[PDB]
mmCIF file of C-alpha atoms and ligand atoms in Angstrom:
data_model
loop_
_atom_site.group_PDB
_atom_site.id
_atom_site.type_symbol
_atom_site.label_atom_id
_atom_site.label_comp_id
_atom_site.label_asym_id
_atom_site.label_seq_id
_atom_site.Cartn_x
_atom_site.Cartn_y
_atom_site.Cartn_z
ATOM 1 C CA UNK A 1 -92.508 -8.615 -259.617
ATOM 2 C CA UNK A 2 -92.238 -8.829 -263.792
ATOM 3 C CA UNK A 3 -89.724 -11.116 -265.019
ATOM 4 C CA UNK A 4 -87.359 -8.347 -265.929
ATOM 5 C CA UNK A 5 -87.762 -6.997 -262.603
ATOM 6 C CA UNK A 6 -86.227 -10.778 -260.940
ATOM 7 C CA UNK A 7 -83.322 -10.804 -263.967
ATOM 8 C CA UNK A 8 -82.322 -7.684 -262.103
ATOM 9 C CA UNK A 9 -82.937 -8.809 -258.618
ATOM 10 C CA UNK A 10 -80.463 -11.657 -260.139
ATOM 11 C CA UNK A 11 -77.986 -9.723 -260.813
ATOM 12 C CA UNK A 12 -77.975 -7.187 -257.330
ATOM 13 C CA UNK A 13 -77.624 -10.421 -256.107
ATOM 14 C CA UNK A 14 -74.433 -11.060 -257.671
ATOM 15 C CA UNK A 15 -73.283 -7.925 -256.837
ATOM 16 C CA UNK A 16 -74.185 -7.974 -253.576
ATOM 17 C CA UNK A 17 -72.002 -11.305 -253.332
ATOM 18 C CA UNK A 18 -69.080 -10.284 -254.617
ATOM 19 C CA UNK A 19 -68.378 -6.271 -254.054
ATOM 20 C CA UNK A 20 -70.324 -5.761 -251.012
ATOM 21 C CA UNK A 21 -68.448 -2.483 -250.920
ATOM 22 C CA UNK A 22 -69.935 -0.900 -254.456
ATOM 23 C CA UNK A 23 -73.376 -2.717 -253.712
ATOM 24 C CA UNK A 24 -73.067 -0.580 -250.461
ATOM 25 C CA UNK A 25 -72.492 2.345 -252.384
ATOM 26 C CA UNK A 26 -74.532 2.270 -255.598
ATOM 27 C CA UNK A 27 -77.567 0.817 -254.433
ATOM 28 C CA UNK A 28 -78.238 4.573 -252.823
ATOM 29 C CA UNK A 29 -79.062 5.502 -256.822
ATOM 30 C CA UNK A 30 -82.576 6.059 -258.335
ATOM 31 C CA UNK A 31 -83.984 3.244 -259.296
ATOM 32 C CA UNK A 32 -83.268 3.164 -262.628
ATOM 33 C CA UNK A 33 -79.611 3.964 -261.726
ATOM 34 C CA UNK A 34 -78.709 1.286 -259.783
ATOM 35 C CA UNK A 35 -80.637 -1.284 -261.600
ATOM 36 C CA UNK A 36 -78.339 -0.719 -264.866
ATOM 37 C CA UNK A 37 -75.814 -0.767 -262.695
ATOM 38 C CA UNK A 38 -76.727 -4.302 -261.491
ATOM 39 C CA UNK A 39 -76.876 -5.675 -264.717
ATOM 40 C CA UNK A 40 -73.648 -3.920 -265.905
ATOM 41 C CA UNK A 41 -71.624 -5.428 -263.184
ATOM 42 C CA UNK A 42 -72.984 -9.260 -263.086
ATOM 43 C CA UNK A 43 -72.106 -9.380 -266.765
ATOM 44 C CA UNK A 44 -68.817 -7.856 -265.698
ATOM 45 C CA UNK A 45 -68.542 -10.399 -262.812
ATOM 46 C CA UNK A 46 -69.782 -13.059 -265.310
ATOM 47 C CA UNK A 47 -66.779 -12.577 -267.140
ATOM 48 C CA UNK A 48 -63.863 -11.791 -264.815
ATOM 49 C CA UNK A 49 -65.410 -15.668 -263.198
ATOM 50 C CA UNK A 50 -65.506 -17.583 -266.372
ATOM 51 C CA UNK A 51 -61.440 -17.091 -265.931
ATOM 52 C CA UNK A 52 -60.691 -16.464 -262.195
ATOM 53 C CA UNK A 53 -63.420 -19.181 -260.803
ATOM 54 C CA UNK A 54 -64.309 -21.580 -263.740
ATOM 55 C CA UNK A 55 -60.727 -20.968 -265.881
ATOM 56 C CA UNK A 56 -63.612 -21.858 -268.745
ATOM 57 C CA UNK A 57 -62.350 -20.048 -271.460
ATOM 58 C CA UNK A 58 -65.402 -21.236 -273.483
ATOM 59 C CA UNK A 59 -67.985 -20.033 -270.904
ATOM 60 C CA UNK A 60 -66.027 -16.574 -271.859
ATOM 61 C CA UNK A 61 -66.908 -17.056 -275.709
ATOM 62 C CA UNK A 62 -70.584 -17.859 -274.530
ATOM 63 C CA UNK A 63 -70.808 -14.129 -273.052
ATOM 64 C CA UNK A 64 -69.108 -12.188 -275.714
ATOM 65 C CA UNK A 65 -71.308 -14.022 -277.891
ATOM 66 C CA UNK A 66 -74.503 -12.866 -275.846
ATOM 67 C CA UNK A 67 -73.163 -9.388 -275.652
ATOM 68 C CA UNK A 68 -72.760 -9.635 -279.531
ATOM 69 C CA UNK A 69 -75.979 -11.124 -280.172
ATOM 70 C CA UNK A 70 -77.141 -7.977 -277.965
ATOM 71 C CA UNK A 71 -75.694 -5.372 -279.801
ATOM 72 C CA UNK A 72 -76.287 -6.747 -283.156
ATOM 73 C CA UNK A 73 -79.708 -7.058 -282.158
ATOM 74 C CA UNK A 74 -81.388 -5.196 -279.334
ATOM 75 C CA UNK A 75 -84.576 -5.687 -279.974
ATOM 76 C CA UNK A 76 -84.655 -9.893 -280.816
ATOM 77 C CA UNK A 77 -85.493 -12.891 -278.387
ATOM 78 C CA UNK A 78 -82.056 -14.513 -277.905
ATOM 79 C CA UNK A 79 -81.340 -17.953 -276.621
ATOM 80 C CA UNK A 80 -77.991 -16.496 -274.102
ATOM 81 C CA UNK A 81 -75.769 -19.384 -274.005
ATOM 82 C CA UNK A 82 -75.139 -17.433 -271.326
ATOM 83 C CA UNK A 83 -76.906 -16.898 -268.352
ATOM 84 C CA UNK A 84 -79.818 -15.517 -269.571
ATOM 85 C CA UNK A 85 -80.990 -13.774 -266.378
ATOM 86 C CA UNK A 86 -77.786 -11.352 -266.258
ATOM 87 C CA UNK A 87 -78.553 -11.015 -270.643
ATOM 88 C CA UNK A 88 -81.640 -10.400 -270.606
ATOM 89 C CA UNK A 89 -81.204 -7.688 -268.313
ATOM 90 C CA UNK A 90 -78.065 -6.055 -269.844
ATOM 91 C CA UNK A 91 -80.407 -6.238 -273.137
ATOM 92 C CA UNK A 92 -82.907 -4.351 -271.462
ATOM 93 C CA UNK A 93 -80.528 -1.514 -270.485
ATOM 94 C CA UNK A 94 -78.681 -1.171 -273.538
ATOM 95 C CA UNK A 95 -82.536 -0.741 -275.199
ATOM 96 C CA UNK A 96 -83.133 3.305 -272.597
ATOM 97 C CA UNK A 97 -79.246 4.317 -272.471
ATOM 98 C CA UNK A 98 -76.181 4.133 -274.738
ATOM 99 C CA UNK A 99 -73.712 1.012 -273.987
ATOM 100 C CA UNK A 100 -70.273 1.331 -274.847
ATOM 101 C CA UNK A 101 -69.666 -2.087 -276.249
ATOM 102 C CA UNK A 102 -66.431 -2.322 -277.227
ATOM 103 C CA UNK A 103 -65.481 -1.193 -273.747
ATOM 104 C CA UNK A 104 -67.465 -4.662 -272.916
ATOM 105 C CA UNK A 105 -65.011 -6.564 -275.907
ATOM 106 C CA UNK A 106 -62.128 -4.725 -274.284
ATOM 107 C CA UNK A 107 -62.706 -6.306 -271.035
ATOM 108 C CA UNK A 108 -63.072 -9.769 -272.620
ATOM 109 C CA UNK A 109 -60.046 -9.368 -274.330
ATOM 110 C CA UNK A 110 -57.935 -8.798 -271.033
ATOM 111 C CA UNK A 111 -59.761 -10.969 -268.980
ATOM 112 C CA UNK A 112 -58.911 -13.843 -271.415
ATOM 113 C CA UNK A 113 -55.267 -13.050 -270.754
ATOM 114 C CA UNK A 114 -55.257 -13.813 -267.469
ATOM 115 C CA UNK A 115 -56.060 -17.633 -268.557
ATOM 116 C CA UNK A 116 -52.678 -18.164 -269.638
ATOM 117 C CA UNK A 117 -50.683 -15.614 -267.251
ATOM 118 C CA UNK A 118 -47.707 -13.598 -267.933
ATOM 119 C CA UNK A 119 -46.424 -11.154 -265.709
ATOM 120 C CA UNK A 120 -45.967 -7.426 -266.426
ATOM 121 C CA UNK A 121 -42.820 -5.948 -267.477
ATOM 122 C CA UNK A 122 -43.562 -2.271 -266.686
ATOM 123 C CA UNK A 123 -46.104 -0.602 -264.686
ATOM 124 C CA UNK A 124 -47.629 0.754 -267.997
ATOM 125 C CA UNK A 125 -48.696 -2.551 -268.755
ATOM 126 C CA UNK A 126 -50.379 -2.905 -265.339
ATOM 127 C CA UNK A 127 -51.732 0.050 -265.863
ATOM 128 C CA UNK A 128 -52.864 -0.866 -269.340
ATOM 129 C CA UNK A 129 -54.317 -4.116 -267.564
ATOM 130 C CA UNK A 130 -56.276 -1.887 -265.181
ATOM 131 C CA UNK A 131 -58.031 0.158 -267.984
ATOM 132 C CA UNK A 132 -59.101 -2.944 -269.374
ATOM 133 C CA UNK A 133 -60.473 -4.850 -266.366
ATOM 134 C CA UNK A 134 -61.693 -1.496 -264.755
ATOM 135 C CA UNK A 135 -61.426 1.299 -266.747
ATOM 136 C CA UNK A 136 -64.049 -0.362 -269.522
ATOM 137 C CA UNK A 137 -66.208 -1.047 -266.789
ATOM 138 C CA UNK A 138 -66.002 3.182 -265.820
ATOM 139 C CA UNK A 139 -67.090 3.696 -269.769
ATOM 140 C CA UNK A 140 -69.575 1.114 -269.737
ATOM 141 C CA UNK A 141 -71.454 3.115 -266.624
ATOM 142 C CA UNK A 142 -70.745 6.400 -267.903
ATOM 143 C CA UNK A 143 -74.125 7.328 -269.334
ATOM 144 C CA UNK A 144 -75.754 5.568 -266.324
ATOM 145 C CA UNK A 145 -73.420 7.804 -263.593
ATOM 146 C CA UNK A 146 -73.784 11.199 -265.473
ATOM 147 C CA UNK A 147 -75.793 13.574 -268.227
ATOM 148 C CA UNK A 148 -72.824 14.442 -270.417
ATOM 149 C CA UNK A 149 -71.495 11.607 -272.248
ATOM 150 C CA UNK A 150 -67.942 13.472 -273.239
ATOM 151 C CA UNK A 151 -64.752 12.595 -273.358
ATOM 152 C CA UNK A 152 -63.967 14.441 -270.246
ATOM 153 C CA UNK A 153 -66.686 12.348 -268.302
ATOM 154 C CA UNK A 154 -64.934 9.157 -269.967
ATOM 155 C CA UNK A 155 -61.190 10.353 -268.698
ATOM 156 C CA UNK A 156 -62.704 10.726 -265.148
ATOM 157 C CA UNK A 157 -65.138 7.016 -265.208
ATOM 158 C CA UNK A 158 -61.853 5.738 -266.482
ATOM 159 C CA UNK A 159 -59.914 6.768 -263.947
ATOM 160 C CA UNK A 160 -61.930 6.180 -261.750
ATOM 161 C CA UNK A 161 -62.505 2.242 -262.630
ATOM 162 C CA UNK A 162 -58.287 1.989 -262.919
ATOM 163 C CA UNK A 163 -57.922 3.318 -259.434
ATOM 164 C CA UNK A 164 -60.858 0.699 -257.961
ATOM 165 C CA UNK A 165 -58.440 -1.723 -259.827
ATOM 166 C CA UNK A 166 -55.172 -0.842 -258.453
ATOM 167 C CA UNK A 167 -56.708 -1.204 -255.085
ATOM 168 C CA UNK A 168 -58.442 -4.494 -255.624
ATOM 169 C CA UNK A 169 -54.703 -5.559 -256.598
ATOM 170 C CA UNK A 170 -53.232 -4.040 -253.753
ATOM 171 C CA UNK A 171 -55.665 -6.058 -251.802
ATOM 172 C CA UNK A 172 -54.833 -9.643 -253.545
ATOM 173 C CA UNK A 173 -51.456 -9.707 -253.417
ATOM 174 C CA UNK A 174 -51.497 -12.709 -251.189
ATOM 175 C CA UNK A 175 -54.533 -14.380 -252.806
ATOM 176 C CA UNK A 176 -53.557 -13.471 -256.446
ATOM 177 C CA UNK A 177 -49.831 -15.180 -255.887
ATOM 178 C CA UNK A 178 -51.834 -18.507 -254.239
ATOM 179 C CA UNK A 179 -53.561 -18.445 -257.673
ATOM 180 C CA UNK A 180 -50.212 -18.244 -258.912
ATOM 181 C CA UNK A 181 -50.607 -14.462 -260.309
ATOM 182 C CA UNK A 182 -48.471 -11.215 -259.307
ATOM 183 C CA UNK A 183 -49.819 -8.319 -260.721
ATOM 184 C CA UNK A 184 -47.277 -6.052 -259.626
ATOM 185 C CA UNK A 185 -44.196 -5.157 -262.899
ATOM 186 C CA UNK A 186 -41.273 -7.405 -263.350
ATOM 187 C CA UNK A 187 -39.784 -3.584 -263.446
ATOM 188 C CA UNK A 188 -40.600 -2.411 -260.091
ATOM 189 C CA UNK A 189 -40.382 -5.975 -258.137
ATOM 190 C CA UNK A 190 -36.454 -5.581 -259.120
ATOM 191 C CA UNK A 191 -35.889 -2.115 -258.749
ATOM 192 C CA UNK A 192 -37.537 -2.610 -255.272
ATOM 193 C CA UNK A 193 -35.691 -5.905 -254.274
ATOM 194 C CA UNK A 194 -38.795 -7.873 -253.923
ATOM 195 C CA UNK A 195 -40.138 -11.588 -254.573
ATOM 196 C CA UNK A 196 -43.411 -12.458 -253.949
ATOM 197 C CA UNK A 197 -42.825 -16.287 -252.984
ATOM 198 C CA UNK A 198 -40.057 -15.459 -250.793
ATOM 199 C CA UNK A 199 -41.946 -12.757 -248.883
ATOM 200 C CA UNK A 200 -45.276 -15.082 -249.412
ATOM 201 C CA UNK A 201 -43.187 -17.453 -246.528
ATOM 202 C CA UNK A 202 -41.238 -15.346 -244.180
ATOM 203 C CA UNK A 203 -43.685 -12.215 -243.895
ATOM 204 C CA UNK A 204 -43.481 -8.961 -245.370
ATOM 205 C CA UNK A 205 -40.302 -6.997 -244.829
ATOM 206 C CA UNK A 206 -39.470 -2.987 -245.532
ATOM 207 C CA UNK A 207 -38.570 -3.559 -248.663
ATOM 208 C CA UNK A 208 -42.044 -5.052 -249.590
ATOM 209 C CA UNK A 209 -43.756 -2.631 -247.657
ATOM 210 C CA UNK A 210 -41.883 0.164 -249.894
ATOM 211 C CA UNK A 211 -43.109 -1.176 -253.204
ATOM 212 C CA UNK A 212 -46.717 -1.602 -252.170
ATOM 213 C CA UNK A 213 -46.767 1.810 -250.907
ATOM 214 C CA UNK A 214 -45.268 3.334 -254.046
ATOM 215 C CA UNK A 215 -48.637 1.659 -255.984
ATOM 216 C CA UNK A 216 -50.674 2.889 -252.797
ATOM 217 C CA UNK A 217 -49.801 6.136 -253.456
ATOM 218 C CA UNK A 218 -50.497 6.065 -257.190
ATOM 219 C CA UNK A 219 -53.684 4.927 -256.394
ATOM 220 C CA UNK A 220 -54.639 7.364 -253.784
ATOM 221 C CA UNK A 221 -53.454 10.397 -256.119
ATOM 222 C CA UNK A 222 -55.489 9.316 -258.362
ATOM 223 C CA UNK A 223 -58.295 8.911 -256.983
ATOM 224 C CA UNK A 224 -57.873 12.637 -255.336
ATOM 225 C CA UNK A 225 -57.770 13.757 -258.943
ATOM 226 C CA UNK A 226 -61.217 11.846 -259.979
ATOM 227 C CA UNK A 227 -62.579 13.268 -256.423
ATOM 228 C CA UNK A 228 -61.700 17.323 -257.799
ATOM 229 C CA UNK A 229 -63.737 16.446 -261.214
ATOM 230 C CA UNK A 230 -66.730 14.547 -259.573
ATOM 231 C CA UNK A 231 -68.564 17.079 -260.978
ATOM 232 C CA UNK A 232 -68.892 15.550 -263.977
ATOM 233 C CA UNK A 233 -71.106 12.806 -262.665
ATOM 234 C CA UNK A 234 -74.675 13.316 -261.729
ATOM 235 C CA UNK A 235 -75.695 15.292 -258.681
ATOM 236 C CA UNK A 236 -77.340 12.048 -256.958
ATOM 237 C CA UNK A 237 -73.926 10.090 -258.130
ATOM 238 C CA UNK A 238 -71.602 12.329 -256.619
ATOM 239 C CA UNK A 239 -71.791 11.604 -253.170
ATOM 240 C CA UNK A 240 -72.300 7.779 -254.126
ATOM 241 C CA UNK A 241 -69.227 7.822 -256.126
ATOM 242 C CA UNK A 242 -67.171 9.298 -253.519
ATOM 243 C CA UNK A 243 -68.711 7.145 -250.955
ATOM 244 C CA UNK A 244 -67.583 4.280 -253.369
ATOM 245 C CA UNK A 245 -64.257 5.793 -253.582
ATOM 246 C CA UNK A 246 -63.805 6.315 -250.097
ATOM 247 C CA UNK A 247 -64.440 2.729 -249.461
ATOM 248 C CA UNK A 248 -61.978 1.330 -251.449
ATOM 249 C CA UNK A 249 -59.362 3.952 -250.074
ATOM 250 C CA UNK A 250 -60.519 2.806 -246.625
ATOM 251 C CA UNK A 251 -59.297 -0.372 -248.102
ATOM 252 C CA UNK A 252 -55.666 0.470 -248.491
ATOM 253 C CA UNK A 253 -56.004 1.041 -244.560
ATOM 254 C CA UNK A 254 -57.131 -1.823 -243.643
ATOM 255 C CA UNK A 255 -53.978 -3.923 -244.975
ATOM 256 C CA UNK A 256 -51.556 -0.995 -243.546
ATOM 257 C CA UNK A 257 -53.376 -2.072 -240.257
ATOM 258 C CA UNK A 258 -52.934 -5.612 -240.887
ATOM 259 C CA UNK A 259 -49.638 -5.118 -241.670
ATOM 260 C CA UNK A 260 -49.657 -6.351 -245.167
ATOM 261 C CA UNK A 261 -50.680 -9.653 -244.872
ATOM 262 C CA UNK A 262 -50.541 -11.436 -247.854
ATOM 263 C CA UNK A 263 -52.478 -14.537 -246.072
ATOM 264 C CA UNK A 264 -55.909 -13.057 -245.733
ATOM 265 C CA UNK A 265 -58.425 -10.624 -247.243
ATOM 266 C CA UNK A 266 -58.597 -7.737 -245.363
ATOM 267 C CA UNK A 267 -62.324 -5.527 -245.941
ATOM 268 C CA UNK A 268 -64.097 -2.801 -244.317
ATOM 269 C CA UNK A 269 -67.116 -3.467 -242.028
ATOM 270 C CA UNK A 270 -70.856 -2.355 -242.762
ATOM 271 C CA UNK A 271 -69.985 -0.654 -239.940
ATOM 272 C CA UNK A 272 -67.542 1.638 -241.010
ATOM 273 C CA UNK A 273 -69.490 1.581 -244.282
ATOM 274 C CA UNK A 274 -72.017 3.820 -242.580
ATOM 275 C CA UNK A 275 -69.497 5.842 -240.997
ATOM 276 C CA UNK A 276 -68.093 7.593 -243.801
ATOM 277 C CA UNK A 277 -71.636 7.835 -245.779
ATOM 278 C CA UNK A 278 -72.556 9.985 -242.390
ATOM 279 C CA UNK A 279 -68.926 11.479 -243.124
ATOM 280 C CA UNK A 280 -69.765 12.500 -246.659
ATOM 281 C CA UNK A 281 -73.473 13.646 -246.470
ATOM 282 C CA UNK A 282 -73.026 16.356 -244.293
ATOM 283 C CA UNK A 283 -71.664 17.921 -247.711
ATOM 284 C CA UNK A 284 -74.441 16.737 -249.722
HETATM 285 O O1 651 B 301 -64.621 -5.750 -263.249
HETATM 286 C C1 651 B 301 -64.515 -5.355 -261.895
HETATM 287 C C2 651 B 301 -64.961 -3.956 -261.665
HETATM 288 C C3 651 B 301 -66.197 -3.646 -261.162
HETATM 289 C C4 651 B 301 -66.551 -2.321 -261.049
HETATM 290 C C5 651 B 301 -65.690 -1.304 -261.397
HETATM 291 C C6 651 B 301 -66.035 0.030 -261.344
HETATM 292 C C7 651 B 301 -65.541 0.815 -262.352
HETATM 293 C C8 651 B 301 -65.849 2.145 -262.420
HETATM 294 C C9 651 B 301 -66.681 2.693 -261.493
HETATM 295 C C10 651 B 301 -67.212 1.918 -260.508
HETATM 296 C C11 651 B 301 -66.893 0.592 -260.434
HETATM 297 C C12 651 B 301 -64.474 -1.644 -261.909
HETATM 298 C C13 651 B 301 -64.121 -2.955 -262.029
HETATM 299 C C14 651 B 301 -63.065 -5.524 -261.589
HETATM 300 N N1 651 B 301 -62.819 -6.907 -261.467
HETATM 301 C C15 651 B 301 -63.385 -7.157 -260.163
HETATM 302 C C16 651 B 301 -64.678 -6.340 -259.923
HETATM 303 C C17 651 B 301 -65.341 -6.302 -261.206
HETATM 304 C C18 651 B 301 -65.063 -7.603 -261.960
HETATM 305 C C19 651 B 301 -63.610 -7.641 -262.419
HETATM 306 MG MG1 MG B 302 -60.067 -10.811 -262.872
HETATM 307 MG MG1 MG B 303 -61.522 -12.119 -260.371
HETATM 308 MG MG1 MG B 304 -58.608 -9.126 -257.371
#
């Protein structure tokens, strides 16, 4: 083992920790592959935490900082304020592929938001929200995931990120509003008759159950449209990606099946994991 090769066993480590479910999935790349993606996603993790875990807004500054000093520089020894492990690996990818930085900026931007929290008004702002959190991330891996950097590649990574996103918020309802956070539009909480405190205390009724399944569905048509383009990725990303994907829809199942709760975190087994890899490689 070089030292580059433990600042990326640092950061599958992180990913391993905290998205079991695209560690499951991505690790199945080349090498190369999934080693970018490693570094990719702890700085992306780094970042989201700073906020969520450490509310350490200048921790955040710290990383945007690194990132700068990165792009500025590729090629010079930097002192990461950081954590220099996840940098020094991020460096070394953005020196053999193309990094979308400002997609990296873009996330920083929104994740710094969420330190002083307003609600959305409109879904378009959620949705907005999920580009930035998600969607960046989808541009950031783009030249990792496929061979044609294009615009159309972008529209799919993108949509592909926002849809991950939706269903990570569909998922944290309960935990999200014990952090004091609902994600889901001042807009369609009224139209749909729903309050998040109330139905935090006396369980989830049919009129909650209706709005989460109108963003459900959003989610899941989307992701059936990223599923018709996956051509655009790689041929050794595709069935990773809709692995991946199929994951995270299994994840919308899993709180139908625990009826909603908004009291724990509902995830799918290793176990059922391997089940729908076996599902989707008789294809590939
Ligand atoms: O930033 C997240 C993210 C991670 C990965 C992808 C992804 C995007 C596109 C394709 C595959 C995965 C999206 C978002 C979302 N949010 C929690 C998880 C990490 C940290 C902040
Ligand atoms: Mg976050
Ligand atoms: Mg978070
Ligand atoms: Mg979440």
């Amino acid at each position: 083992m070089t030292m580059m090769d433990m600042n990326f066993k640092y950061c599958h480590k992180i990913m391993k920790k905290h998205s079991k479910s695209f560690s499951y999935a991505f690790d199945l790349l080349p090498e190369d592959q999934r080693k970018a993606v490693w570094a990719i996603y702890a700085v992306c993790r780094k970042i989201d935490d700073s906020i969520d875990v450490y509310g350490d807004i200048q921790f955040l500054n710290q990383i945007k900082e690194d990132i700068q000093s990165i792009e500025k520089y590729p090629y010079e020894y930097h002192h990461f304020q950081s954590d220099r492990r996840i940098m020094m690996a991020l460096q070394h990818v953005a020196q053999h592929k193309n990094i979308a930085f400002q997609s990296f900026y873009n996330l920083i931007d929104t994740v710094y938001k969420d330190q002083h929290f307003t609600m959305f008004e409109t879904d378009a702002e959620l949705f907005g929200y999920c580009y930035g959190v998600a969607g960046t991330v989808g541009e950031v891996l783009t030249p990792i995931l496929s061979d044609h950097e294009t615009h159309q590649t972008y529209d799919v990574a993108r949509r592909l990120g926002e849809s991950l996103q939706l269903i990570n918020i569909l998922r944290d309802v309960g935990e999200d509003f014990e952090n004091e956070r609902i994600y889901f539009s001042k807009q369609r909480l009224k139209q749909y008759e729903v309050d998040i405190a109330e139905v935090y205390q006396n369980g989830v009724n049919n009129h909650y159950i209706d709005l989460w399944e109108y963003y459900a569905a959003i989610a899941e048509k989307d992701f059936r449209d990223v599923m018709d383009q996956i051509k655009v990725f790689s041929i050794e990303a595709q069935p990773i990606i809709e692995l991946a994907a199929r994951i995270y829809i299994e994840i919308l199942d899993e709180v139908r099946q625990a009826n909603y709760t908004l009291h724990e975190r509902v995830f799918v087994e290793k176990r059922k994991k391997a089940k729908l890899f076996h599902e989707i490689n008789s294809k590939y």
